[PDB]
């Protein structure tokens with residue numbers, strides 16, 4: 001089991017952040033001075049990912065230009081002696097990491113975006129990271145999940161408990177415990193009503209998936225329904241990662257991430 | 272009489288890298304809206320119909336924001352999301368137009384303004400710097416335009432600043448003509464505190480007569496305004512409104528907090 005490829009779906013419409021997402025993916029919005037997608041990419045690279053796969057939509061321009069070289073910007077900075085800032089631009093990706101881009105044909109859903117990556121993944125297990133789940137963790141959450149996936153020989157979903165009123169926001173798993181932090185998944189259901197949700201254990205935007213998922217995404221698109229079918233055929237585990245998740249998919253969550261991370265890592269204090 | 276506005280949108284925002292690697296500084300959002308869109312909405316609210324964007328790196332970030340995107344409108348309308356479709360169409364109101372001109376190189380605000388001359392022609396025009404995010408009950412540009420038409424001259428938006436801050440601003444020497452407006456007799460660019468003639472600073476709002484263009488053919492805007500002073504009337508106006516200096520991370524944060532509260536109900540936990 002070797003997980004070296006990561007898929008970043010960044011092709012959604014971003015309607016909760018209009019007008020800012022008119023011509024920019026939601027994942028390119030900054031938290032202070034860094035786009036959401038760069039936090040997630042940095043986490044993946046720290047977890048041993050070498051092959052980055054960006055699934056883009058009509059707003060691909062900003063994602064491409066963020067991770068590709070900007071020789072004109074580097075020329076300027078280099079000329080003005082700003083070697084400090086030069087690294088912020090050219091060293092976003094270390095040299096042992098590569099990226100590629102695949103355009104999702106239409107915004108047909110997260111499951112369809114993951115399936116769109118199949119030509120670059122092949123028959124390899126792979127990571128999926130949803131950058132609007134911004135996670136502050138002392139050990140990269142993706143690394144935590146990859147270690148479980150290697151040890152237990154299966155797919156792994158990052159999960160954490162949520163208030164029962166919040167189940168309508170998330171995929172919710174039914175499972176049976178395996179150790180303190182890990183459970184074997186017996187069902188997953190997307191955004192159930194709180195009165196119907198089988199548990200309050202919710203999927204965060206971090207996945208390690210066996211390539212078997214792709215055939216199920218063809219016969220499904222919602223990613224959660226592909227996973228629920230994968231269950232019937234292979235092992236899927238849910239892991240309670242250590243870390244603080246900010247749900248930046250809403251204006252409110254992004255705001256509280258700016259406040260909390262602004263304070264902790266930048267000393268930004270509300271007046 | 273003022274219906275054209277120039278928006279320099281070439282900011283490198285080096286203090287905001289890597290966020291500004293792929294978009295100009297003026298595209299960064301405060302809550303859910305790019306800085307440039309606050310400034311454009313202020314201009315449109317003041318009767319501006321012709322938007323003139325002076326671009327630099329990542330020019331299509333600005334263009335794709337303001338240009339219609341039929342693909343997006345087609346998808347929203349098909350999903351019955353009619354409030355969101357109207358929001359997207361209001362980014363550029365139907366009576367408003369915009370055009371794009373490239374700055375040849377980063378030669379300062381004065382060069383950027385001069386770059387807009389072919390689009391402005393001989394009429395008076397506004398300049399708005401999107402990093403100065405101003406929240407006011409009456410649009411600040413409207414306040415300045417009203418003064419310009421009344422007094423038949425150019426108008427600089429000003430506010431008092433700490434003397435220790437004058438190296439950040441253009442500073443005006445001037446004589447009161449009414450409670451909020453002064454007649455400018457001199458302007459100096461970013462003086463040392465110990466040599467600043469006053470503490471009355473120009474913020475990023477201008478209403479300028481087209482005569483400025485010949486005086487800029489002087490690379491700094493303050494030097495152009497000082498030459499314009501020898502031939503035409505220039506006033507400074509203490510606008511009413513709260514300015515957020517979004518040129519620093521600290522200032523942009525205070526704008527997110529304050530406007531988050533006022534316009535979106537968002538309260539720090």
Ligand SMILES: O=c1ccn([C@@H]2O[C@H](COP(=O)(O)OP(=O)(O)O[C@H]3O[C@H](CO)[C@@H](O)[C@H](O)[C@H]3O)[C@@H](O)[C@H]2O)c(=O)[nH]1
Pocket residue numbers: 008009010011012013055104106107108109110113129130131132133169170171172190202203204205223224249
């Ligand atoms: O056509 C599309 C639609 C979405 N996206 C991307 O998909 C992600 C978000 O998809 P969306 O379906 O809006 O996600 P959520 O509603 O937050 O729910 C997902 O993410 C949650 C974790 O945040 C999980 O609990 C849910 O099970 C899972 O479906 C983002 O990366 C988007 O860029 C695409 O690339 N293409």
Ligand SMILES: O=c1ccn([C@@H]2O[C@H](COP(=O)(O)OP(=O)(O)O[C@H]3O[C@H](CO)[C@@H](O)[C@H](O)[C@H]3O)[C@@H](O)[C@H]2O)c(=O)[nH]1
Pocket residue numbers: 278279280281282283325374376377378379380383399400401402403439440441442460472473474475492493
């Ligand atoms: O080569 C350049 C430099 C700047 N800009 C744009 O011009 C504005 C800011 O220019 P800069 O000269 O860096 O502004 P400040 O240092 O804030 O000073 C200007 O703005 C102040 C108000 O904030 C005034 O007091 C000053 O007189 C005036 O020079 C932004 O819209 C930039 O995108 C360009 O397009 N090209």
Ligand SMILES: [Mg+2]
Pocket residue numbers: 130132133248249
């Ligand atoms: Mg989300």
